[PDB]
Write a protein that binds this ligand. Structure first.
Ligand SMILES: *[C@H]1O[C@H](CO)[C@@H](O[C@H]2O[C@H](CO)[C@@H](O[C@@H]3O[C@H](CO)[C@@H](O)[C@H](O[C@@H]4O[C@H](CO)[C@@H](O)[C@H](O)[C@@H]4O)[C@@H]3O)[C@H](O)[C@H]2NC(C)=O)[C@H](O)[C@H]1NC(C)=O
Ligand SMILES: [Cl-]
Ligand SMILES: [Cl-]
Lengths: 191, 188
């Protein structure tokens, strides 16, 4: 079996504690959590593990140190995250971007471009395409979903299927809070 | 002013590691606790200075012991009574940066849906074992779940073929994800 004793803190960019939870789980079943408007642990599971949920709530509620600790959950959250919180909510890393050809898929077009965006943080990033300076594929999803690398950087890519014409220039426009100005990468059939 | 989540997960289990503690800021891991070393370990060097503060040792101790208490005291009693929750690990492998032959890169092996949190990851190059860069980072995520990241530094070549082998520890299941060089970016 696996068991959990999980605490969560919700704070804003400034470090102001907005919420706080403390929940116990067993066998991936959420059983009992702290109830501020009751000052004690209260069952969350009413299925087969209901009695266990009440037993765990009981044992924990008889722990004065824990009760006093949870009563101050909000303050504990602010105090504990205080030394680093500001550095995190302000943390950003600009994206690197490169355009190049890729094997076409799910399309009839002969050519397919891939705009690679990586090394950025946070994960929110927008990518749009421009043909000879004008927007294209307006009905696409500019707000992209990104793959986490696990080291506080992310990556994603946008595609553009097309037929080349030697005079056309395609530009990948990347916007990310980690970069003051949009990032542009050009591509032409003769490159 | 948007909200952000600080996740502090103390977990324990029948198996190795018997107990763990993972902390994350939104989707990313900040620290993991080494109980054999009595200390927080930073996910990144830049978090090293923050991994020193130990103002919450008693809370960690309290949560740790209560967690181990449920696995030890309760559990043997539920053994047979309820079905053990288990999830097959899903592994995916990809390069940290866009592929460019002859240029240093790093292969990432991301494991999700891991439950219970017991695993071993092995890297291979053409069916040949090869040691990875640094440790495998296991972290807790919202929803009572776990994930892991492993890395391998290498210089890609046209004939390369790599694989990440994930063993849901103690032979529960084995997953394999393959990586092949494709759509390499043109070199200068
Ligand atoms: C992230 O941080 C906080 C995490 O919870 C969150 O805090 C508040 O979120 C809601 C703000 O929209 C609060 O909802 C209120 O809850 C009250 C208690 O039930 C309600 O009485 C209240 O009713 C509404 O009042 C409005 C104003 O008159 C009215 O327009 C509505 O029609 C309705 O009558 C409202 O629902 C919530 O309680 C707060 N959470 C806490 C502290 O417990 C932040 O909102 C969130 N911030 C961001 C940027 O996402
Ligand atoms: Cl805490
Ligand atoms: Cl949307």
């Amino acid at each position: 079996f696996v068991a959990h004793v999980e605490s969560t803190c919700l704070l804003d960019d400034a470090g102001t504690p907005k919420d706080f939870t403390y929940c116990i789980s067993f066998n991936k079943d959420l059983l009992t959590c702290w109830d501020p408007e009751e000052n004690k642990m209260a069952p969350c599971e009413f299925g087969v593990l209901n009695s266990l949920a009440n037993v765990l709530s009981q044992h924990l509620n008889q722990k004065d140190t824990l009760m006093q600790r949870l009563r101050n959950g909000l303050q504990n959250c602010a105090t504990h995250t205080q030394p680093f919180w500001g550095s995190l909510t302000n943390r950003t890393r600009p994206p690197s971007v490169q355009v190049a050809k890729t094997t076409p898929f799910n399309t009839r077009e002969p050519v397919m471009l891939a705009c690679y965006v990586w090394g950025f943080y946070p994960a929110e990033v927008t990518i749009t395409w421009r043909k000879n300076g004008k927007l294209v594929m307006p009905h696409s999803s500019a707000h992209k979903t990104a793959q986490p690398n696990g080291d506080w950087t992310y990556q994603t890519l946008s595609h553009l299927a097309l037929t080349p014409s030697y005079g056309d220039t395609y530009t990948c426009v990347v916007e990310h809070i980690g970069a003051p100005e949009p990032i542009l990468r050009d591509w032409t059939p003769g490159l | 002013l948007q909200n952000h989540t600080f996740l502090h997960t103390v977990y324990c289990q029948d198996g190795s590691p018997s107990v763990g503690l993972s902390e994350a800021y939104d989707e990313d891991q900040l620290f993991f606790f080494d109980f054999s070393q009595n200390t927080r370990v930073p996910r990144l060097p830049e978090f090293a200075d923050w991994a020193q503060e130990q103002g919450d040792a008693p809370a960690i101790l309290f949560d740790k012991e209560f967690c181990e208490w449920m696995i030890q005291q309760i559990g043997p009693k539920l053994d047979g009574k309820i079905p053990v929750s288990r999830g097959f690990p899903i592994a995916e492998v990809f390069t940290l940066k866009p592929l460019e032959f002859g240029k240093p890169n790093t292969l990432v092996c991301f494991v999700s849906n891991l439950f219970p949190p017991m695993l071993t990851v092995n890297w291979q190059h053409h069916s040949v074992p090869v040691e990875g860069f640094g440790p495998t980072f296991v972290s807790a995520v919202d929803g009572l779940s776990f994930q892991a990241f492993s890395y391998l530094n290498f210089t890609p070549e046209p004939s390369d073929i790599f694989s990440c082998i994930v063993t849901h520890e103690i032979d529960r299941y084995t997953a394999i994800a393959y990586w092949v060089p494709r759509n390499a970016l043109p070199s200068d």
